[PDB]
């Protein structure tokens, strides 16, 4: 149907905007602490602690498969990256502190992303 195609165009445009958001958020992690999944070889007890691991590479895979239907779903995954880190790692670690900085700097980006999704009408 034309309606299916129109919905697909909307999803494709959302994916374009979220790719831009993702790039901006990842720039706020210059240490690349959140770039890849936590290694279960190197942290073998991780899944005893963290029930839903997340990282930027895993978000990018879902994104390129157009697997985010709205901004809320994308934000859920970003918040997992930060929240997982702030539970597993203590306050006096480079990891926890990187997550605080990513949260703080990323909030700015997400604030405007919300306005753009609403404005242009992408979901």
Based on Cα principal axes, name the global outline.
elongated
Tell me the major beta sheet: none
SSE order, as H and E? HHHHH
Quantity of strands, as a count: 0
* Radius of gyration using CA atoms only: 16 Å
The fourth-level CATH homologous superfamily is Bromodomain-like
Structure class: mainly alpha
Number of helices: 5
Q: Which CATH first-tier class would you pick?
A: Mainly Alpha
Walk me through the structure.
The chain has a single domain (1-123), classed as Histone Acetyltransferase, Chain A (Up-down Bundle), CATH 1.20.920.10. Helices cover 68% and strands 0% of the residues. It contains five helices and no strands. Helix 1 (2-27) runs antiparallel to helix 3 and helix 4 packs antiparallel against helix 5. It starts with a helix and ends with a helix. It is found in: Nucleus; Chromosome. This is Bromodomain-containing protein 1.
Which helices and strands occur, and which strands form pairs?
Blueprint: H1 2-27, H2 46-49, H3 56-64, H4 71-88, H5 94-120
Helix pairs in contact: 1-3, 1-5, 4-5
Domain Bromo: 9-113
Protein name: Bromodomain-containing protein 1
Subcellular location: Nucleus; Chromosome
List keywords for this structure.
123 residues, Histone Acetyltransferase, Chain A, Bromodomain-containing protein 1, gene regulation
